[PDB]
Amino acid sequence: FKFPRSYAALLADWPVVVLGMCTLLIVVCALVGVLVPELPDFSDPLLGFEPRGTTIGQRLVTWNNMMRNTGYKATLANYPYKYAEEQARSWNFQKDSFFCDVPSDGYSRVVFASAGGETLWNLPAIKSMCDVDNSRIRSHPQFSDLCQRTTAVSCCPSWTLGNYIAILNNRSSCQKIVERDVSHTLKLLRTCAKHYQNGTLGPDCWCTNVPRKCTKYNAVYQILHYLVDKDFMTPKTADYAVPALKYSMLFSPTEKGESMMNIYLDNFENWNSSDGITTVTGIEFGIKHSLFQDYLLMDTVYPAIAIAIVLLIMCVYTKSMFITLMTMFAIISSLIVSYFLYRVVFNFEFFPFMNLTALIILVGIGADDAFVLCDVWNYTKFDKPRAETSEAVSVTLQHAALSMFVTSFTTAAAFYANYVSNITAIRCFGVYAGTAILVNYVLMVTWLPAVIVLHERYLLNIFCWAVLCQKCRRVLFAVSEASRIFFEKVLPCIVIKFRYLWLIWFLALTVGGAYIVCVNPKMKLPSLELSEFQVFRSSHPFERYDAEFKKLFMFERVHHGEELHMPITVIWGVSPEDSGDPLNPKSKGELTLDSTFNIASPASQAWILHFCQKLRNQTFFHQTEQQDFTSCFIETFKQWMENQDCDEPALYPCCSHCSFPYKQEVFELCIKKAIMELDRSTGYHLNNKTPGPRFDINDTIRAVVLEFQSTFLFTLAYEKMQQFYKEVDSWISHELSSAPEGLSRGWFVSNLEFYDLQDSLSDGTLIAMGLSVAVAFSVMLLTTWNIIISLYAIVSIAGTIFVTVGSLVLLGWELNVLESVTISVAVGLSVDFAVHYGVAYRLAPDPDREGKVIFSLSRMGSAIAMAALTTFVAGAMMMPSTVLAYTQLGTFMMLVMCVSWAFATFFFQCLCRCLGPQGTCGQIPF
Numbered sequence: 001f002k003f004p005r006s007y008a009a010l011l012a013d014w015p016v017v018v019l020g021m022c023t024l025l026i027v028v029c030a031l032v033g034v035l036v037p038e039l040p041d042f043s044d045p046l047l048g049f050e051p052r053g054t055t056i057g058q059r060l061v062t063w064n065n066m067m068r069n070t071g072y073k074a075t076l077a078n079y080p081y082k083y084a085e086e087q088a089r090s091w092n093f094q095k096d097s098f099f100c101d102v103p104s105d106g107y108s109r110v111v112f113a114s115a116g117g118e119t120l121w122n123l124p125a126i127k128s129m130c131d132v133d134n135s136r137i138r139s140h141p142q143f144s145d146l147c148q149r150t151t152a153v154s155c156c157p158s159w160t161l162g163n164y165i166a167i168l169n170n171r172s173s174c175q176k177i178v179e180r181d182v183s184h185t186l187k188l189l190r191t192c193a194k195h196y197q198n199g200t201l202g203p204d205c206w207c208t209n210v211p212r213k214c215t216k217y218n219a220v221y222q223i224l225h226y227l228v229d230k231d232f233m234t235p236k237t238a239d240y241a242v243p244a245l246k247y248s249m250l251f252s253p254t255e256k257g258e259s260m261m262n263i264y265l266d267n268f269e270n271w272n273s274s275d276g277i278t279t280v281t282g283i284e285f286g287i288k289h290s291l292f293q294d295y296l297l298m299d300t301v302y303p304a305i306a307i308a309i310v311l312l313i314m315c316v317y318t319k320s321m322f323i324t325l326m327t328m329f330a331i332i333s334s335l336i337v338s339y340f341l342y343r344v345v346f347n348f349e350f351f352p353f354m355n356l357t358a359l360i361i362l363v364g365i366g367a368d369d370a371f372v373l374c375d376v377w378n379y380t381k382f383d384k385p386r387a388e389t390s391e392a393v394s395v396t397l398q399h400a401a402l403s404m405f406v407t408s409f410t411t412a413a414a415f416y417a418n419y420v421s422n423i424t425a426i427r428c429f430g431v432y433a434g435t436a437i438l439v440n441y442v443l444m445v446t447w448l449p450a451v452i453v454l455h456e457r458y459l460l461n462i463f464c465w466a467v468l469c470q471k472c473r474r475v476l477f478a479v480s481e482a483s484r485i486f487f488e489k490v491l492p493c494i495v496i497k498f499r500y501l502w503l504i505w506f507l508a509l510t511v512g513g514a515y516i517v518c519v520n521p522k523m524k525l526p527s528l529e530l531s532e533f534q535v536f537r538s539s540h541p542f543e544r545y546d547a548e549f550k551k552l553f554m555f556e557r558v559h560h561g562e563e564l565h566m567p568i569t570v571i572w573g574v575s576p577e578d579s580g581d582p583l584n585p586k587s588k589g590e591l592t593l594d595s596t597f598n599i600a601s602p603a604s605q606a607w608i609l610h611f612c613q614k615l616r617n618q619t620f621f622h623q624t625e626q627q628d629f630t631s632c633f634i635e636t637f638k639q640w641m642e643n644q645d646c647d648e649p650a651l652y653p654c655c656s657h658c659s660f661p662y663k664q665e666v667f668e669l670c671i672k673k674a675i676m677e678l679d680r681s682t683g684y685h686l687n688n689k690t691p692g693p694r695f696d697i698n699d700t701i702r703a704v705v706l707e708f709q710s711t712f713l714f715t716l717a718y719e720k721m722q723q724f725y726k727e728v729d730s731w732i733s734h735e736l737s738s739a740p741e742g743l744s745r746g747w748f749v750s751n752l753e754f755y756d757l758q759d760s761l762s763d764g765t766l767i768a769m770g771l772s773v774a775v776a777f778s779v780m781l782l783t784t785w786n787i788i789i790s791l792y793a794i795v796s797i798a799g800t801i802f803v804t805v806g807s808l809v810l811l812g813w814e815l816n817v818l819e820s821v822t823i824s825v826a827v828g829l830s831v832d833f834a835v836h837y838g839v840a841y842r843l844a845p846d847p848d849r850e851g852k853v854i855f856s857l858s859r860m861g862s863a864i865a866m867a868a869l870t871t872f873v874a875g876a877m878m879m880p881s882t883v884l885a886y887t888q889l890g891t892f893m894m895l896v897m898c899v900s901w902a903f904a905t906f907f908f909q910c911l912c913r914c915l916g917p918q919g920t921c922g923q924i925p926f
């Protein structure tokens, strides 16, 4: 029998036990992790982007549960269906010479710009647009199945300038037009645009106040409204010898959607996008989110190239391809083991596509501890040459293992702090990436020291070319000693000799970053709808369509310019709750009816009439010359009763003789009659969105809905939508507080989905960042046991963060979903170089603060720079990517390494050289 008396003896005496047991546990996690759970589905990028458990979120979830469960023999109905049954017992533009339809937002389309920046209103450009449509769309084998038709002989014509010129100038097609048709149609537009600008000319005049010349085919209206950019025909542009057409649109007679993807993938995806006359600058085929998964999985080639560069750096630093490959195996194993823990142990069903971004992060930050442990091992061999391997192991762990933990933990804690967000995808990403970071640490203090012991024991001897080897060894020596001279002589001189320059420069940058973040221009919230969220780089044609061209065309602007009033919907008899799993996007739970509700009592009838009339007297209510007889159903019912006659006994309980507080049995009787009477007398039809009573399976009223229109207009601005929400919710809450028992539990809902998202981005970032800062300063104290070093560190970290976040604001980032996570993660990353220099400063033998800074830079500079570099390189490799999340994360990684390294190496070490503690000054007791 044999057994090691300590962990340092286990690593030294039995390395193969540690590596064998680790490899076994890893292949078990790999096998069970791929065999047991359902694989991730990335087909919707926006899955999990709704807050869950917010007041507004639960009411919004509840109102959606009510709408899916309303209908014949559903949980709820608009119609009393038991009563309904119980009563029922008693192309060529000369020959054809029209377009098949008006252009619309439902058709597949492309935006053209000029090659070489000239105006598109010329015969070469006009034909080149028709040429691209024929060449790239109508030619495709499934166009003929997808296109609209008048007969099986041919598809409909496309809507483009050349075909409007052909129909107006009696040509057969765009290909047969001549230069006189182009200038004639310009003179027609340039003179008739007046009546479009003034609002007289309109869609269907083929309006008689406009000269007939204009109204032909609706062509002048359709060109100006659909096909040309808004700046073309305005009084400011039209007085030019030729007005400048910068952009034009083409519409295809095929519908937007997943049917477009073969046409896209064959003819557009790998295309040059230019004919040499004109360039396709925007595409709207209805396939942006449907193409996401392909680009997402293809772009995994750049994280793979990043692994090869991080292997080169680490092999040159360690001088060992064995230690290097075994270190990268442990890095990748931490992603596998974290995935097994996440899906099998923690039981997360949802895996957001941002969990794939954890590979880039771990490739970048995974090897930092290997640089530390290898440096400390080499220092330990040098300062104890005659040590037994278990003593060389224990001394190496005594020096390295805590520093390695505080640096891993502060970044993991920053990821886990995002689990306070209400947004499901943010919480799921925080838990997965935080777990991979901690699993990577466990491997760096088990696997990696056992690998270092096997290397030491065997591979120092075991496992023309000899010339190439000797020449390579000579270059590797030169790089070693040049780097040693830099970190141990050059860099300490540059930091210390210019300390008063550095303190002024880095403090001025800190004040500048704080002004940009806290004063002007501050970081903004997202400013477009969730279905308009960017997924590709902004140069992609699908993103340029949304970011530029939706502003420049009149038919697209009409959708923005709409004066849409906020609805005020008030629901009783249902509980506003989210009984689904808040970590699963597809688990919305079931509708919960309220058992204390009662509309039918005389007191409930009386109060809910008075609520309707008191609400109509508010300044938030919009009065209309058209009455709405749906809005408050009890007024329309009271009105109907006051028009019922009494000479037939079959109508008697419903008589006009009855005072309004109807006996409970007359209310639930005559309401059913009134609802059935409506359905055939008026012919008005009730759908799941219509306000009224809701009946259950055997016709008892289990819910009531009211709806009113507001003065407040729907906006994407946070500050104004917060004033609508606070004004109406606090008035309705105050008014409800005096309601009868059985109406005091009602609730208000409206189009608040985007405001709830904005409110959760703002809240979750503040809390996750406050938690991330609290952990960073706490471990800084517990690492250093000195308040002065801990103050200089947290001030350098604060300057790092203000410069990092102010730089993201100058680059034009908003506080959207992944951006909001990077801001707490900045804190967690920014810790590391200040804790490493801070421990080297206290460790220093030298009594004088200058000698302590020289020892700190000398000992620690090499490993700190290798860590910064491998993270910067992992970020730089993501820059060719098509997926926007990969380019945003790689941009953040480069920037935060530069700022973090500069503030740690120069500013923090200059504070230590000017006023760093000596003896026991600032030291904390036990």
Ligand SMILES: CCCCCCCCCCC(CCCCCCCCCC)(CO[C@@H]1O[C@H](CO)[C@@H](O[C@H]2O[C@H](CO)[C@@H](O)[C@H](O)[C@H]2O)[C@H](O)[C@H]1O)CO[C@@H]1O[C@H](CO)[C@@H](O[C@H]2O[C@H](CO)[C@@H](O)[C@H](O)[C@H]2O)[C@H](O)[C@H]1O
Binding pocket: 297, 298, 299, 300, 301, 303, 304, 307, 356, 359, 881, 882
């Ligand atoms: C958390 C992990 C999530 C994993 C999710 C699953 C991903 C599965 C698909 C991964 C994937 C890339 C490789 C990724 C490696 C890293 C994997 C992860 C490991 C950790 C990092 C497989 O790529 C495959 O690689 C094979 C070779 O390995 C190759 O084999 C061939 O040669 C053999 C030899 O002669 C021969 O024998 C065999 O017969 C051949 O066919 C296949 O043809 C090829 O499809 C998909 O991309 C494929 O390749 C291209 C890449 O550029 C990609 O290019 C486009 O987009 C790029 C991006 O914008 C861009 O750069 C390119 O310019 C652009 O053109 C292609 O569209 C796509 O087809």
Ligand SMILES: CCCCCCCCCCC(CCCCCCCCCC)(CO[C@@H]1O[C@H](CO)[C@@H](O[C@H]2O[C@H](CO)[C@@H](O)[C@H](O)[C@H]2O)[C@H](O)[C@H]1O)CO[C@@H]1O[C@H](CO)[C@@H](O[C@H]2O[C@H](CO)[C@@H](O)[C@H](O)[C@H]2O)[C@H](O)[C@H]1O
Binding pocket: 626, 627, 628, 629, 630, 633, 634, 636, 637, 639, 640, 643, 671, 674, 675, 678, 682, 684, 686, 691, 692, 693
């Ligand atoms: C789940 C409930 C859903 C309710 C759905 C309601 C649907 C709308 C019907 C409401 C209704 C019938 C009610 C039938 C009984 C229903 C009982 C139900 C009870 C259970 C809840 C109310 O009928 C009202 O009757 C009153 C008398 O009782 C009468 O009052 C007066 O009395 C004396 C002169 O007769 C006088 O001397 C006295 O001074 C007055 O006071 C009003 O003038 C009259 O409008 C008919 O109102 C008409 O509705 C039209 C659209 O159908 C609507 O059309 C316009 O607007 C449309 C856009 O909106 C648009 O598209 C149309 O193009 C447009 O032309 C009219 O503008 C509207 O006028």
Ligand SMILES: CC(C)CCC[C@@H](C)[C@H]1CC[C@H]2[C@@H]3CC=C4C[C@@H](OC(=O)CCC(=O)O)CC[C@]4(C)[C@H]3CC[C@]12C
Binding pocket: 021, 022, 023, 025, 026, 029, 337, 345, 439, 442, 443
């Ligand atoms: C070498 C690699 C794989 C790095 C990680 C090594 C270990 C630290 C991991 C690998 C598998 C993990 C185990 C996977 C499954 C479980 C079952 C789980 O079982 C319980 O009964 C939990 C009950 C509860 O929820 O309270 C407890 C944690 C445990 C042992 C895990 C603890 C941590 C383990 C041993």
Ligand SMILES: CC(C)CCC[C@@H](C)[C@H]1CC[C@H]2[C@@H]3CC=C4C[C@@H](OC(=O)CCC(=O)O)CC[C@]4(C)[C@H]3CC[C@]12C
Binding pocket: 014, 016, 017, 020, 021, 023, 024, 027
């Ligand atoms: C790769 C994973 C998935 C499974 C590995 C399972 C076993 C095949 C491993 C686990 C622990 C290993 C053992 C750990 C320690 C040693 C002591 C080692 O002793 C020595 O002094 C080296 C002698 C030599 O081989 O020259 C001999 C191999 C052995 C028995 C190892 C053989 C292979 C073992 C049984």
Ligand SMILES: CC(C)CCC[C@@H](C)[C@H]1CC[C@H]2[C@@H]3CC=C4C[C@@H](OC(=O)CCC(=O)O)CC[C@]4(C)[C@H]3CC[C@]12C
Binding pocket: 319, 320, 321, 322, 323, 325, 326, 328, 329, 459, 460, 462, 463
């Ligand atoms: C990035 C991940 C996927 C790497 C996974 C690596 C493993 C498949 C392991 C198992 C056995 C290892 C090999 C065992 C022995 C050697 C001999 C070794 O010979 C040397 O001259 C070592 C010199 C030195 O490093 O000091 C070079 C590495 C290599 C091929 C090892 C490289 C890493 C291997 C292939």
Ligand SMILES: CC(C)CCC[C@@H](C)[C@H]1CC[C@H]2[C@@H]3CC=C4C[C@@H](OC(=O)CCC(=O)O)CC[C@]4(C)[C@H]3CC[C@]12C
Binding pocket: 033, 034, 039, 040, 041, 042, 043, 293, 332, 335, 336, 339, 359
């Ligand atoms: C760093 C790596 C080595 C470990 C990361 C943990 C893996 C065990 C997980 C994380 C994400 C998973 C992938 C997520 C997505 C896909 C695409 C899927 O193929 C599709 O085309 C899915 C189509 C669809 O369902 O819509 C095949 C499985 C795969 C590669 C999964 C395989 C297992 C992966 C790599």
Ligand SMILES: CC(C)CCC[C@@H](C)[C@H]1CC[C@H]2[C@@H]3CC=C4C[C@@H](OC(=O)CCC(=O)O)CC[C@]4(C)[C@H]3CC[C@]12C
Binding pocket: 007, 008, 394, 395, 397, 398, 401, 442, 445, 446
């Ligand atoms: C999820 C589970 C598997 C994680 C459990 C943690 C362990 C895998 C690691 C993490 C850091 C390791 C420690 C890092 C540093 C040291 C100091 C080292 O040296 C001393 O204690 C010197 C004592 C002396 O001789 O005076 C001994 C091993 C030890 C305790 C290590 C023991 C194993 C630890 C606790």
Ligand SMILES: CC(C)CCC[C@@H](C)[C@H]1CC[C@H]2[C@@H]3CC=C4C[C@@H](OC(=O)CCC(=O)O)CC[C@]4(C)[C@H]3CC[C@]12C
Binding pocket: 481, 482, 483, 485, 486, 490, 865, 866, 868, 869, 872, 897, 898, 901
């Ligand atoms: C990417 C960010 C976040 C981290 C930045 C780290 C750099 C400041 C480090 C990484 C590698 C370092 C280099 C490694 C080796 C050398 C050789 C060294 O050569 C000498 O001192 C002269 C030797 C001779 O005279 O032969 C000069 C500095 C330099 C370029 C170093 C400068 C500092 C570098 C660029």
Ligand SMILES: CC(C)CCC[C@@H](C)[C@H]1CC[C@H]2[C@@H]3CC=C4C[C@@H](OC(=O)CCC(=O)O)CC[C@]4(C)[C@H]3CC[C@]12C
Binding pocket: 489, 490, 493, 494, 497, 902, 906
């Ligand atoms: C630290 C901040 C400002 C951002 C990163 C620094 C870089 C922008 C580099 C590029 C060129 C560098 C400069 C190149 C040459 C010199 C002269 C050098 O003069 C000395 O007296 C050196 C003495 C010695 O050799 O020991 C002092 C540092 C300085 C200003 C360097 C400081 C760091 C600089 C500005």
Ligand SMILES: CC(C)CCC[C@@H](C)[C@H]1CC[C@H]2[C@@H]3CC=C4C[C@@H](OC(=O)CCC(=O)O)CC[C@]4(C)[C@H]3CC[C@]12C
Binding pocket: 517, 518, 522, 523, 524, 525, 526, 718, 719, 762, 763, 765, 766, 769, 773, 797, 798, 801, 802, 805, 815, 823
């Ligand atoms: C103290 C040091 C160590 C770290 C820096 C912390 C804060 C001073 C900064 C960094 C990022 C800032 C946040 C970035 C973005 C926003 C969105 C912003 O939302 C708005 O409504 C802005 C106007 C609008 O968009 O309508 C509210 C402030 C907030 C949370 C900021 C509050 C102040 C924060 C947390």
Ligand SMILES: CC(C)CCC[C@@H](C)[C@H]1CC[C@H]2[C@@H]3CC=C4C[C@@H](OC(=O)CCC(=O)O)CC[C@]4(C)[C@H]3CC[C@]12C
Binding pocket: 503, 507, 510, 795, 798, 799, 911, 914, 915
């Ligand atoms: C909100 C935060 C991110 C920025 C503002 C922080 C300031 C309120 C404090 C915190 C630490 C202070 C620094 C602590 C130490 C020094 C070194 C000190 O050096 C000397 O006095 C050198 C000359 C001499 O020794 O006589 C000069 C002031 C300075 C930069 C201080 C200036 C004011 C600082 C930056």
Ligand SMILES: CC(C)CCC[C@@H](C)[C@H]1CC[C@H]2[C@@H]3CC=C4C[C@@H](OC(=O)CCC(=O)O)CC[C@]4(C)[C@H]3CC[C@]12C
Binding pocket: 537, 876, 878, 879, 880, 881, 887, 888, 891
């Ligand atoms: C290519 C080799 C031979 C020279 C590398 C020179 C370096 C100084 C590297 C380090 C960072 C690199 C930059 C990192 C990022 C970008 C952004 C990239 O644009 C994008 O992909 C947009 C990214 C985003 O949208 O977030 C264009 C190249 C550029 C300037 C890179 C150019 C080359 C740089 C300056």
Ligand SMILES: CC(C)CCC[C@@H](C)[C@H]1CC[C@H]2[C@@H]3CC=C4C[C@@H](OC(=O)CCC(=O)O)CC[C@]4(C)[C@H]3CC[C@]12C
Binding pocket: 537, 873, 876, 877, 879, 880, 881, 882, 883
């Ligand atoms: C020496 C260290 C600092 C690492 C250097 C990394 C470089 C090799 C990277 C940094 C920026 C990269 C470039 C950033 C952006 C692009 C645009 C990209 O354009 C595309 O059309 C493909 C991507 C897409 O379609 O989204 C082609 C590669 C290229 C030049 C990249 C090639 C690789 C570069 C030069």
Ligand SMILES: CC(C)CCC[C@@H](C)[C@H]1CC[C@H]2[C@@H]3CC=C4C[C@@H](OC(=O)CCC(=O)O)CC[C@]4(C)[C@H]3CC[C@]12C
Binding pocket: 494, 897, 898, 899, 901, 902
């Ligand atoms: C933007 C920030 C975050 C990172 C910048 C990293 C490097 C690009 C900078 C940091 C310090 C700079 C160095 C500061 C001093 C020198 C010494 C200078 O002179 C010599 O090498 C000879 C010195 C002698 O022995 O006399 C040449 C430029 C160099 C290497 C500089 C090149 C650019 C360096 C490596």
Ligand SMILES: CC(C)CCC[C@@H](C)[C@H]1CC[C@H]2[C@@H]3CC=C4C[C@@H](OC(=O)CCC(=O)O)CC[C@]4(C)[C@H]3CC[C@]12C
Binding pocket: 509, 803, 807, 810, 811, 812, 898, 899, 902, 903
């Ligand atoms: C802490 C310092 C001493 C060194 C850190 C690395 C530097 C190379 C970083 C820090 C701040 C960065 C700057 C922060 C902000 C901007 C504005 C940014 O955006 C714009 O000017 C607007 C672009 C647009 O039109 O959208 C372009 C890059 C730039 C100059 C950055 C370039 C790289 C800088 C100088």
Ligand SMILES: *[C@@H]1O[C@H](CO)[C@@H](O)[C@H](O)[C@H]1NC(C)=O
Binding pocket: 198, 199
């Ligand atoms: C349209 O132009 C006429 C003059 O031709 C002008 O009287 C009228 O006020 C304009 N329309 C509007 C909405 O002002």
